[PDB]
Every structure is written in C-alpha cells, then in structure tokens.
Write a protein that holds these residues in place. Structure first.
Motif, PDB file in Angstrom:
ATOM      1  N   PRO A 109      48.391  30.870  -8.302  1.00 56.74           N
ATOM      2  CA  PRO A 109      49.847  30.891  -8.496  1.00 56.74           C
ATOM      3  C   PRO A 109      50.721  29.884  -7.755  1.00 56.74           C
ATOM      4  O   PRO A 109      51.809  29.575  -8.232  1.00 56.74           O
ATOM      5  N   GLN A 110      50.280  29.380  -6.604  1.00 53.29           N
ATOM      6  CA  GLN A 110      51.079  28.417  -5.843  1.00 53.29           C
ATOM      7  C   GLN A 110      51.531  27.195  -6.642  1.00 53.29           C
ATOM      8  O   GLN A 110      52.706  26.840  -6.606  1.00 53.29           O
ATOM      9  N   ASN A 157      59.962  27.990  -5.340  1.00 55.23           N
ATOM     10  CA  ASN A 157      60.677  28.084  -6.604  1.00 55.23           C
ATOM     11  C   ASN A 157      60.184  27.029  -7.575  1.00 55.23           C
ATOM     12  O   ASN A 157      60.879  26.051  -7.862  1.00 55.23           O
ATOM     13  N   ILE A 158      58.977  27.235  -8.078  1.00 61.49           N
ATOM     14  CA  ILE A 158      58.376  26.306  -9.013  1.00 61.49           C
ATOM     15  C   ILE A 158      57.443  27.048  -9.937  1.00 61.49           C
ATOM     16  O   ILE A 158      56.461  27.639  -9.489  1.00 61.49           O
ATOM     17  N   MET A 159      57.759  27.012 -11.228  1.00 59.65           N
ATOM     18  CA  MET A 159      56.941  27.655 -12.245  1.00 59.65           C
ATOM     19  C   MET A 159      56.530  26.577 -13.253  1.00 59.65           C
ATOM     20  O   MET A 159      57.289  25.646 -13.529  1.00 59.65           O
ATOM     21  N   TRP A 160      55.313  26.697 -13.774  1.00 61.20           N
ATOM     22  CA  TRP A 160      54.761  25.745 -14.733  1.00 61.20           C
ATOM     23  C   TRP A 160      55.136  24.278 -14.493  1.00 61.20           C
ATOM     24  O   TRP A 160      55.337  23.508 -15.436  1.00 61.20           O
ATOM     25  N   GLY A 161      55.221  23.896 -13.225  1.00 60.38           N
ATOM     26  CA  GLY A 161      55.534  22.521 -12.881  1.00 60.38           C
ATOM     27  C   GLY A 161      57.002  22.158 -12.812  1.00 60.38           C
ATOM     28  O   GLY A 161      57.357  21.055 -12.388  1.00 60.38           O
ATOM     29  N   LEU A 162      57.866  23.078 -13.211  1.00 58.98           N
ATOM     30  CA  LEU A 162      59.283  22.780 -13.188  1.00 58.98           C
ATOM     31  C   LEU A 162      60.039  23.561 -12.138  1.00 58.98           C
ATOM     32  O   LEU A 162      59.630  24.645 -11.738  1.00 58.98           O
ATOM     33  N   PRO A 163      61.156  23.004 -11.668  1.00 62.78           N
ATOM     34  CA  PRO A 163      61.985  23.644 -10.651  1.00 62.78           C
ATOM     35  C   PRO A 163      62.573  24.902 -11.240  1.00 62.78           C
ATOM     36  O   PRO A 163      62.777  24.987 -12.443  1.00 62.78           O
ATOM     37  N   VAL A 164      62.849  25.879 -10.394  1.00 61.35           N
ATOM     38  CA  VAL A 164      63.437  27.120 -10.867  1.00 61.35           C
ATOM     39  C   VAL A 164      64.826  27.307 -10.292  1.00 61.35           C
ATOM     40  O   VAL A 164      65.030  27.266  -9.074  1.00 61.35           O
ATOM     41  N   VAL A 165      65.787  27.514 -11.174  1.00 62.03           N
ATOM     42  CA  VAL A 165      67.143  27.703 -10.741  1.00 62.03           C
ATOM     43  C   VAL A 165      67.574  29.128 -10.981  1.00 62.03           C
ATOM     44  O   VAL A 165      67.731  29.567 -12.118  1.00 62.03           O
ATOM     45  N   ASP A 171      65.231  38.483 -11.982  1.00 64.49           N
ATOM     46  CA  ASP A 171      64.091  38.268 -12.867  1.00 64.49           C
ATOM     47  C   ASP A 171      63.047  37.388 -12.158  1.00 64.49           C
ATOM     48  O   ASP A 171      61.836  37.670 -12.209  1.00 64.49           O
ATOM     49  N   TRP A 172      63.525  36.333 -11.494  1.00 63.76           N
ATOM     50  CA  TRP A 172      62.659  35.410 -10.761  1.00 63.76           C
ATOM     51  C   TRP A 172      61.772  36.188  -9.804  1.00 63.76           C
ATOM     52  O   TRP A 172      60.570  35.927  -9.692  1.00 63.76           O
TER      53      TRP A 172
END
Lengths: 280, 280, 280, 280, 280, 280, 280
Positions: D197-198, C203-211, C178-179
């Motif tokens: 997007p970055q 790996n960073i979306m809307w300011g948060l880390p993505v796991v 999905d990522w």
C-alpha cells in the motif's frame, strides 16, 4: 596457486600454542554492574530521606484568594555483611601438584562472586542475608494484567509500574529460560514477533536492555531503575589467605584455603524496583 | 587468561560508589511543553474573539432586498492564579543532616510542577482552580465510530473532528496504559500493525506525536492543536525561599521552606481541542 | 547535584514569553492551486474548441491540387462573477486595539477565499454562482466496476476514465473522511493495504496526489487533469478597502471594511474531469 | 511567528494567474520513442534481408563432394506516407480572439502526433495506412499458458516467445487499465505482489520497462525488442501553415490552417514482436 | 509553457534517420565464459591425473616400519577440432549493397560461435564432435531426493554433490523455461519463495549465479565448478576470409566468404560437474 | 549497432587463456580454527581439573556448627597421535612433468588436513584415533524438546544446554544439507522463517554463527563454546619429505612422497559441548 | 464674355467623380441615417435600460421637513453580426477594364447597405439575424383611432403614442407604395390633404423625416424616436478585399472580390418605437 590450505603449504605453518589448561563455562556476572558502586570503611551505612508534592496551582478569579500548595524526615540504616567459604586440602596434594593452589584461588574467588550476585538479587532479608533487589522491591500490580496478555505484555506493564514512582526503568532482569520463550513468541499467524528465523532478536524488549542471569529464579522477573535505586558498598575486597595451623591441621598434614568478602547493599528508592511472577 | 573474575584480576578494579543512602521514580513532565508559552506582569489577561461571523450572503432576486451580514464579539478574561506549598523542618534535623535541605528544595520544586501539570490538563474550573485543556475542550463526536473500529481508528476520527473546526491537530495525549494496548494492535493474520516483535513502534500515530502521561486519566484521550489552541502565561517562575523567623519558628527551633509559582492558562480556540472516551 | 528542576535551581530560569495571544484551525486551501490561472479585464470570457483547427494536410500527387485547411468548432462563454462581504466596526474599537485591523483583514481575506473554493469545486450555474468542476464533470463510468472492487479500485478505474480524454490525471479530490476510510482499507486477511499500524500512508493513491478538502461533499469523488481541463480567470484580485464615510458612518464613528474579488471559471476539457459516487 | 495563513500575512500573497484560457488532458506519447529513429529525404526505403544465409556446412565423407553454401535474399521496400489534417476558421473569430491562432496550432500538432501513434502501433496495413507493430507481429503462443497463470504469468511467457527469435525483449506495451489490474495483483495471503500500500510499484515487469498507452487496445498486449526490430523514418517534421487565399476563403472571410507530416515505418525483424490477448 | 511534445513545439523537431534497413534477436553467449581459457599451437593436448597422490602418512609405533607413499595414474588426450561454414554471394550483390559485406561477417561469426557453444555444452563425443560438459559430467545422485522436494530443493542437492568431490560449485546451468518455473515456486500459503508479484527475483539460487541458456536441453540441468573443471583451448581464433578465385568463381563474377575456428575442450575434473533430470 | 557477435566485432576480443592442462573444488577447512591452539614437544599432555566444587556455604545459627565444603580433583591425560599418508610415483613421470611435484605436495597437505578435521570433530576416541568433539560432548537433553518444535527450536534448546555449564556458546556446527533444510524452514502460512525468496539468509542462527562442514555427519549437530572447551596441541607441523632410496625404489626408478603431522586434542570442559540428533 | 457653358470655356472644367457607389442609388435617408451611431471593438454590447425616478421636489415652508425623493434598471445584451457577399470575376476582365473594379466595389457596397437596412428594420432577432426595430416595438394603440380618419391620422396618432415613453418621435418608416399613396391623399372635395403640387417637399410628414423602404413590408408602418431610443454600433465599416489565390483561383486566372461589414444594434427604449398596421 600456493596457498595456506592443507593440501598445499599450510603444513609449513605452526598453530600458536596457548599456555596452560583452561575449566567449565564461566557464568557472566551482572546484577552488580547494574548498581551504583562505592566503598566505605565502616560496619554500616546511614542515609536520610524525606518521609508528596500537593500542586494546587489553578485558575483564579480577579480579587480572589489564590490557592495554597505544599511539598513533603527519617534516618535509614544499611548494614555491612560478610560472605565467604573455605576449602581444606591435604599438604601432600598441594606440594605434588604446584599450580593447584593457583587454580583453587581463582575458583573460590569466582564462586564467591557468584553467590554474591545471589544475595544482591534474591537477598532473603532473614538473619544475616542481604536485603536484595527482589525483597525490597514493590510487588507487581496484578491489577494491570488483562485477558489474553503475552508474557511480554506483562514485562511491559511492569516497565510502566516503575513510572508510578516517577523514575524510569533502566533494565529487565529475566531468567535465561523465560527470555528465550519470550523471544520465540509467535502471533496468531505463526510469525515471530521478535525475529523471523534468520536471527534471534537482540536483548532489547520495550526500549530497555535485557539482562538474562541464571541468578534470577525461573519464572520470576525484575524491572526497575537500578542505576538509581540501590548502591553496593564494598568494605573489604575479595581476598584469599592460607593456614597451615588452623584447627587440627598441623597434626593431619592439611591446609586451609579461605576466601572472604565484605559488602553492604543500600536501597534508596524501592518504589523504583518491581518483582513479578508470570501466572501460567 | 587474565580475566575480571575475583580469582583473577578483578581485584585491581574498584567498584564505583553511589553517593547517598536509599529517590522515587521521577515522572517526566509534558503537556506544558505542548502549549504556547508567554510571559506577563499582570494579574490577568484579556483578549477578544468573534462570538462570530454571521455570513448571510446568498442569492437574491431582482428588485429585492439583499441580506444583512455581521461580524463580532466578546471579551474574555484569563486570571492569574497562584500555586504553592511549604514545609516545616526542625532546626536540628536540618543541621544534623546537611544534604537534607537541597533535597527538600528539589522536591517542592518538582511537586509544584507536578500539580501544575495537573491544572493544565484536568483543570477543574472551580473557584480558584485553573480551567484546563480537558474542560475547555469540545466533546468527541460519538457518531464517527463505526461498527468494529480499533481504538486506533477512534483517535483517527478524533484527529479529524479537529479539522471540522478548521485547524491542524498537534498531538495525541493518551494514558500510558491505553497507548500500550494500541501499539500491540494486531491484524487478522497475527501481524503487528505498528511494529513486529523486534521493537515497539515509535510514539507516532496518524502523523502526529504521541504524549503518554499519567496525567491523562486512564481511559480518557485528548487530541487537539495545542501549540495554537491555548497558551500558558507565566507571571512568576517557581521559586524557593526559607524563613527562620516565620511566626513561632524562632522560639521553636523551626525552619519554613516555601515554594510558589504564578500562572495563567488561556484558552483561545476550544474548538481545537477534543476529549473523548474509549467504549470498552 | 545542582539541577534544573524545582527542588534545585530551576527557579533561577525564566521561561521565554511568546508575545501575543493566539485563532482557530485555519483550513488549508487547495483546488484553486490545481487550476491554471490568468488575468483579464472583461466581465466574461469567450473561448473556442474543436467539436477548431481543421487540419487537412495530406499526401499529394504531382501536378495535383493541394488541400486547404482552416483555423477558428464551438464557441463557449464563461461569465465573471463577484464574491464579497463586509464588516462594520466601531472607530473606537479599531483605535483601542491596534492589531484588530490587521486581524480582521486576514480573517475576511480567508473567509472570502474559503467561499471561493466552494464555487470552484461545487459550482452551480444558477444565476450568480460559478459553474464549478463538479457540475461540468463527466459522469463516472459505472461499467468499469467489477464483482468485488474496493473503493480504491474505483478511484483507479476513475483515473483511467480520464485517459479516454487522452490527458493525464492530475490528482484525486476526495472528502477528508472518505480518504481516511480508504487508507484504513484492509484485505481478506485483515492487514492494512496502505500502511499497517506503523504509520499513516502518505497522501498518494495510484501514483497521484490526494487532495482532501472539506469543500468536496461527503461521498463524492473527483478525479481529473485539472491543470489542463480548467482555468481560473481573475478580473479583480481579492482586495480589502476601508471607508469612514460609507453611509452614516462619519457621523456615528464607524468604519466599514470591505472584502471582494471578481472571478470566472472556464472549463475547456470536461472529458478530463470525472465525478462519481461511492455506493456503500 | 507570522506566516502565510489567512490569520497572518498569507493575505499579502496573491496567486499568479496563468495567462489565457484552457486545454484538456494531453496524453503522453510513447510508441514512437520505443523505436529506432532516423531521417531520410526519399520517396521510400529499401533494405535487404536473408530469407538468407543458407548454411549447409555439415559432416563430409572422405573424398566426397563437399556442401555448397550461399549468402543473399530478398529486397524489401518500405514506403513513405503523408499524415495530415486542416481546419478552417472565420477571419473574424481569428481576429477577435488573438491567441486562438497559436492554440489551433498546438492542437493540430498534438492531434497529428496522436494519430501517428495510431499507425505506429495498430496500423491497419491496408491501402495507404502504415503497417503497425501489432499487424506485423507474430502471434502469441496459446500453448504457453498454464492452469492458473496470472495476467503477469502471461506477459512473462510473452517475453520468452521473443527469445525464440533470438533477441532480447525491450518493453511491454499494455493498456492503462490492464496495467492497473496487474499491479494490484495479490497472493493467497492478501499481500501485494508488486507493492505494499505505501506506493505503486514502478512501471517494470519481469525486468522490462512498461508503457501504458491508451493507444493499445484494451485486453491486448505487445511485447517485443522494439529498439531494433522496427525503425521510424522521418521525411518531414510536423509543420503548421496558414492560407488566406485558399479557394473561397478570401471571398468568404475565412482562413485555413494546415498541419502535415511525412513518415515511413520499417519492420526489420517481425519475429521480434508479439501480440496477444488476455483471454478471461 | 512552450514544451516539445505534440501540442506545443514538438513539430519543429525532426527525428534523425538511421540510414539503411536492419536483425532477429541475438541469443546471449554464455557457456564459454564459464570455462577457463587458454592458447595452444598443437594438434591436441595431453595431461596426467591420479586415478594420484597416494598419501599413506600415519601414526607409527616405536621401532616399527614407516608407511610408504607414492605420487603419479593415467594419461588423457584431448583433440583439437575444427568448426566452420562458408557462404557465397555474387560479386554484383556485394558491390551494390555496401554494408552487406560487414553484415554477412557478423552473422557467420555469431553463427559459428553459436554452434561452438553447442559443442561446449552438449558435445556428443562421436567422431569429430567435441566432448562437452554434459557428456563428461557425473550423473546426479537420485538418493539425495526426498519425499516432497521442490525443483529448487533438487538443484540444492546438486550443488552439494559437487562437494563430494571436495570442490566448490561455480554456477547453475538451467534451461530458460525451467528457471522460470522455479522462480514462480510457491509455498503452502500461496506466497512466492523468490518472487512476490512486485518483480522477478534475481538470477541467483542457493548462493550461486544462474545461467539460463537455451543451449541447455529443456528438462536437463547442469551444476559444477566450471572455472576449475574444464578448459577451452583455442588453436585458431574465429576468423573470416574472402576469396575471388575459389573454384569457378572468377569466371562467374562470384565471391566466397569463409568463417572457421579451431577448438579443443579439456575435462580435468569430471567429479566437479553434475547433470540431472527433473522427474515429474 | 556495433556488437560483439561474431559477424560484428567479437573478433577484436581475445579469450583469456587458463594456464596448464587439466583442480577440483577445494573444500573449506574449519573445525580447527574454532579451537584454541598451542604447540608442545611431548608425546602427551597432562592437566588437572576440579571434579567438583561441592559448595555448601549456608546460613548458620549463633553458636551452631557450620557447613563443610570440598573441592576436587582428577588428573586427565591426552595423548598425541600421528596422521599421515604417502604417494609413490615414477622417476620418469616426476622428471618429465616438473610442476607435478609441486601439485602432489599441495595435495597431500590438503588431503591430510582434510582427515585431520575428520578427527578433531568425529574422532572415534577408540584405538589410535583422537578423541573428537563429538565423543567428549555431553548428550543433548531430550527433555527440552516440546510438542511441535522445529529443527531450529532444537538448536535453540541446545544453545541453552551450554548455559547449564555456565559458559557462552561459540557456534553451531551443522551438516551443510541440514543447514539448508533449516533455512528453507516455513511457518504455518508457507512463509520463509529466515528469508523470503529474495535471498538466502546469512549463516547466523540464534545469534551464533553457523559452521557447515561436510565433516559433521548428516543428521548430527554440535553446539558448544569451542573457543575454550578444547585445545589442539601440535607436536609436528604437517610436513612433506621425499625419498629416492626407500624400499626397493632405487632399483625401480621410483620416488616416495611422504606427508605426516603430529596432533593431540585436549578436552578441558566437556560440559561446554553438546551433540544431538534430529529425529524426523 | 468668357463663360462656363459648352460654347465657351465650359470644356476647361472636368466633373468630379463621386468615388464609390452607395451607378444607381436613390437619394433618400436610410433607416441608418435615422439612428444614433457609434463604434466598438467588440463581439457584443452590454447596455442598461431604465425600467423609476420618484421626484417629490416641491415648495417648503421654513422650519418644515423637506420632501424625500428616490431613484431606481435591467441589463441587456446585443450581439454583433456579419453581413457580406462576394463576386468572382475574371483576372483578364479585371485588368482590361480598369474602371470595372471601381464599380463592382461601390455596387457591392450599395447592395450591402440595402440588406443592412433590412436587418435594422425587420430583424428577426433570431439566430444570426439582428434584433431589428420592428421586433422590439410596442404595438400601436388602436384605441386612438377616431371615427373615420385617414391613414395619415394614424401615423400622427403613432407620433403621439411615442410620448408615453418620454421621448419625442424622430421619424417615419413606410413602404414606398404606401408612402406614394398617403401623399396623394385627398379630402371629400379633391383638395390634397398634404400640399398641392405647388410647393411639394419630400419625405417629410407631420414635420418628421420619412424613410420609404422596400424593406418595410407593404401595409406596415414604423414610427418611433430613432435618433435616441436605439443606436447602431459598427464593428467594421463596409470594406472590400480581393484574393488572387482563393481556393482554385490562382490556377484559373480568377479574382474573388469580397465585401463585408459587421455591426450590431441596441435598443435603449422599446416604448419609443411603435409599429402598426393600416386596416384597409
């Protein structure tokens, strides 16, 4: 505020005069500098090359017969030729305008070297003309072109074709005009692929430097690993002599200014050079 | 002005001579550098892997018999094959053209290493051949492709399929041509996804390095975690020897130049490598 | 020219051998690292939450009777479970391959920790399974979506839903695939929202880390303030013991390698964890 | 090459367990830090403002009576209020779970501080409540909106309205949701106005910091020169106390935990704050 | 962790109270700092300008009459005006509210300086008013506008008109409102020329700084080389004096606070300043 | 807060005084610094250039007649002219305002140099006027323009036309207004070719610097290799002298200030300069 | 004759006061006294019940194969509850009568112990109630009754029914009224079934102890092996505490005397406890 302005003190400052009169634009030479140089004292050069690495290294079962591999002469001659031109001028003129000879020399010198480039690049191969980069070179592979490729795509394709020789290219030699039309290349959106209106992009395409010489025919391109494919062998440097008695001069009050040079262009690895034609 | 033109001061400068009479394009070697390298003194390697953790842990009813689990195993043998080839030259040729020898050496050496790459990547598996990355590899999963994906998207999907084996991808091995087409990939506006016309983007896609070798067949792509999937075991470094007495030779005024090497390619985790094909 | 390739002196150079034989893709463990950790010596944990600090502090008149307060409300129980597996191996095998033991350990240790992730995320509550993040989770608020939101837009809304709890979102737990399909998200004009074709966005979306863990089911997404919402309580650290007497081992020359651990997952603030579904 | 994988030694490494059981998402307190702070030791504060520098300076005819001016005025009182709450828990729960004590503290504490924000921003102004930024503030000027302004365009107009007071704005107080939807504002090209997007653009709009607090009602915005328009006066810092003998308690095996604080909110310049609604 | 937020120890910490009640927004003074400043001790200033360096230097034929040149002309007078205002408050108020004294000062000061700026820019020229920038300024040249120019295009034309006086422009004085509308200027695609949603562009247009003062009438713009076109001559710095005996004061327990200042605005080169009106 | 308003601390701040009683924007000179400079002591310069190197060198058959070549020539003359102007001022003025003389000098000097530039560029070449870059220059080749070229494209073409002379272009001389309207050049999307709204692009187009001088008539553009196509020859540095007895001065208490200069503009290579017109 | 009766030295002796009221309080065994007792520092108890021991031990001929036996449980939980009550008394009263507090203590404890017995027996097993003896018991086996046998016979039958649990019956729990009657049970001639008034014992029937409790519902009877089948677990012995500040006490000169106790009850074998109803 006492400044160097016109309406201030500038007047007290005298511009420094540069001696003499200058001459049309002098074309910047190149082709020659891309090649390896060295001199000789002979009328011709002889080098020798091998006339395929068959690598069968592979996986081998225990107790099994391993694989056999193999590696793979001819003498090649490169002749020295002569380039030159001369000017005939009246004894009168020459005596009345002192610095005229000085000028005619500098002019024949340049003019010679100009045509010299000419050979090195587009060297016919007929009669005496040198065998130039463009002739020797292996022809571009029309095969690589694809539906909808920019001229740039081609130069790229070409940079690749050099790889099939197993050496890397070192430069791209396009015609100044073609280079321009390539830089101003736009995308479907109308943006510049190389440089937004602020400034022209540098003379670098696909990682390689770009040499724009008028010497290169309009619509013709050359890519290769010049620094390792050919070498220029100088036999006699450019020189100028003068004759008062040449032919029927003495009796016509005429002088003859001669300018000649002796070269030899060797081509070790042709597979390392490619000549192509934009087809549009 | 005192310039470099011929008709000025140019004369004071000697073109540099490039030794030799005109080597083809020398291909840049890789692949081998992607694999883990070891060294042995045997004619074969043996390692052991689980054919298998059968984890049957599950939920159990009261008073019921619990599940039986098991761990494994199989022994894998990796043979050490031999790669080589030789050349025969006239005692005369060799004496008349001095440098010819050192040239023949550097060529067999390269040629050997070139066919070596050949095995490492597309190693047939037949009898004596080595078994190479592209053979051992697990096929690409056609199901990840989605309606309208750029070739780029595919390599992405690929980097993922490596994750399904639970390992990190190491790099992408595309064919030089394919790589090109991927870089000049554009968006619906006309903009370049990897790099506006100024300069080609670097060889990095989806966070991984990109190795473009001609070794990789056109239209085929290989993604894996090389540095951890397979390993190259050297038995004997590439070497060149010469014999003047080899059979006929002495009495025929002949020389024999030989070049051999001894390898072994081991494939620990094949699930970690992936081979696929772009559907054009 | 005396070089390093085969044709020259390369032969004199011996590649350095990396001792040992190389293991499949090792997955990167997470989730556990997103939660608070602690010890315990019981078979279950009991914690208390306000539905309790009853703070009646207020304003008081002169000569007036002050307010009474108290401290404890709901009581919640979280049981401790047991995860484990064992492998039975031959005494001979174990002595004939020295490092085989060391390997079997890191292999069980891993596998264990792998199913551990499994519980922690997609728990269950069913009998012996752990109740995990995704079960406790508060349903995503379908009312936040708006005509034309992109997947990203949703995770965004989700990061908000975590605000209603009055805690800060900690990270986004998506499924690796999905990522990917999220990063390659484009706009109405076709250019990439996150990274153009230059390189994959971090790996960073809307300011948060993505796991991205394969553990997370495909099509399911989890946003929350993990470091605050839940806590993992260890009764017994993952360990490994070996028995040469287990069952009829002594008499069959067999070893039993056991790997177990005792966990307990507590969920303090569920309002801080959101689970949802991308409706494609 | 041994590392921290489950294959190498990352097994010898046991995670550190965070003592005790968990806490939900703890939100970031803010509104308070925007205001001027100071302490007192009184029932209330009194300050004096001009209703008044009555400047009648003007142009005066010859030999005529000049204008009389004055300086003041009104006295404004700002009262100190009391905020608190208590919680009672059984002597047993408290004795059985040792850390429940300290937890109820940190919660009553936070909780208090939370409702504090409540008053400071959306303070009702009724009865015993506080007058909050939003109540005192001057309303947004609907006339500034223009055909097709973005939400951003508005906050911009808002920042201006603060100028009509003759002071600079200090920050923008938006609702987390509204903020998000603004940051992702696009142009007719599909480009991100605030950040490609970055990465998410920093919390700064029109040159001012942005505070996204759930405290701020959705759809409502507050722009003003907080740093010197209002001031928070602390009389008593938040404190937690415990009673064993409060009323019943002793005889009911109960404890009372209290948490109170004493404030005072002063509003010097209301013309310095604006409250508006995105109407769409 | 033991933090200083609400839920943790935040409570143990008491905010510091700023004694006293507080001010409306303070406009930022500007127009003064644009001009050249200087001292004086007179009733007015006189300066002389050419209406003249009549320079007829030229080329002269042999034995012909040389050309006559001259230096000068007109005399310009700039008067010194007086700005001030006073405020009277009761002796009681002043003694009972300590800081009221200083507050009243800073206010009259600022207030004075405010109307001061007023003169400097829009100085009427009538009776006692100063003659300010906008009055002297040479009218914008409507002939520079061209079909389809943005407001920006105009200010550009403006900066140029300054050049027809052979002087460089210093800055642009627009009305805060107009400046705004200019920054949000868009192209036919919908992208922002200076803007681009992320953040407002800096206060710099066409290489010159931009001064946005409310003092500048909405719809009016001023471009010029201020630092070299006009000069402010201070005769008396703004000062504050207090009197207890002023008229029937002593007998009414009253005080009188006075604030005055003495200026003079000189306009050397008017062609260096330009005033215009956006017509739409 | 301790600010620098009037009623606060502004009083402690002393405005800086601009000495003297009210200089206009001082225009920046250029054209001259683009040309080669040198001084002479004659009333004219003579130089000689080839009119033509008719080079017919070619390939020649055995025993066949070879080609005849020629070189030319023409003598070119360049006269030196005289530029100057004078001013007449009263003995009284000059004595009553000491610094007036200094000012008048710096002004005549400037004004002179201003008109000097005027000649150098747009020098009519007629009567006594110099022959300016624009008169000598070779006309722009209308055939290079192509359907839909931007003004930018044209200067580009122009930069090329200089190449047909065989010299490199030195710079681009556009009119300040035209330069502007070029920078704000947009694409089919409305994007700025040279620079997004953030900041104006540098004065560099197509790799060459850009010289914006009001001297260049609007609508006219000049490109060439100035640095060596023309040369300025100074006969008499700009100077200033004063006469008290001129004409009828002595008897009118008058002074005469004279400012003259002696120039000569030489044009060696015209083929290296190009003049053209934007036809919009 | 110095004796210890009233008339002699009996006065020298003071009776010892039994510290604490269990003052009333019958002398009888308690449902407590019948059970096994333990102690715990917990909130609940986790015990285990045997639900099979197949013992095939036997005689074996030599040379012959011996017999195989086998052993086989359920997890049970038992929560701890709280019993308590308090009394509010005057501070004055409590100080003026010293002996008074001593009584209230013992009396409140006695009263507590009664309700304790209540839960131990008829414990609802529901919400806060304990899981009592009667709720667990296996119902009496009606199939044992004989044609016309006394209420006595039944209890005797019950004593037997216990056996089928593998435990010996410990005691009998009847209702006071019922016990009183069962004791005076006569035959058809008048002889007492039990023992004539001659040597009457006490609460002992069928060689077992008897607990006559009003808790035991009239007409119901409980027989089981209490001393082993079930045991009481004390968490807190009966205790008395006093508060002078409880709620509004301090200000009313009141004291609050609290008396609580907290225990739990576990049943290891239900089959060992039997409850039935007298059908009469």
């Amino acid at each position: 505020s006492l400044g160097s302005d016109a309406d201030s003190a500038g007047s007290l400052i005298q511009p420094m005069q540069i001696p003499g009169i200058i001459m049309p634009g002098l074309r910047r030479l190149t082709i020659r500098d891309l090649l390896a140089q060295g001199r000789t004292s002979s009328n011709a050069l002889e080098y020798v090359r091998e006339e395929v690495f068959t690598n069968n290294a592979d996986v081998v079962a225990e107790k099994a017969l391993k694989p056999e591999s193999d590696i793979t002469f001819s003498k090649q001659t490169a002749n020295v030729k002569t380039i030159a031109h001369w000017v005939q001028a009246s004894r009168q003129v020459m005596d009345d305008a002192p610095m005229l000879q000085s000028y005619i020399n500098n002019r024949l010198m340049y003019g010679l070297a100009l045509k010299e480039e000419g050979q090195l690049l587009n060297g016919d191969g007929t009669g005496d003309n040198l065998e130039g980069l463009n002739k020797v070179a292996t022809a571009y592979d029309t095969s690589l072109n694809a539906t909808g490729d920019t001229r740039a795509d081609i130069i790229a394709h070409a940079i690749y074709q050099v790889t099939e020789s197993e050496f890397s290219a070192s430069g791209i030699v396009l015609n100044p005009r073609d280079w321009h039309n390539i830089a101003l290349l736009k995308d479907n959106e109308g943006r510049y692929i190389f440089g937004g209106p602020q400034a022209f992009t540098s003379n670098i395409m696909w990682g390689l430097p770009v040499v724009p010489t008028k010497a290169q025919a309009a619509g013709t391109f050359t890519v290769g690993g010049f620094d390792m494919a050919s070498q220029v062998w100088d036999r006699m440097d450019a020189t100028v002599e003068v004759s008062r008695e040449d032919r029927d001069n003495f009796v016509k009050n005429m002088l003859t200014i001669l300018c000649e040079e002796r070269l030899a262009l060797a081509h070790y690895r042709p597979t390392a050079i490619i000549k192509g034609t934009f087809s549009s």
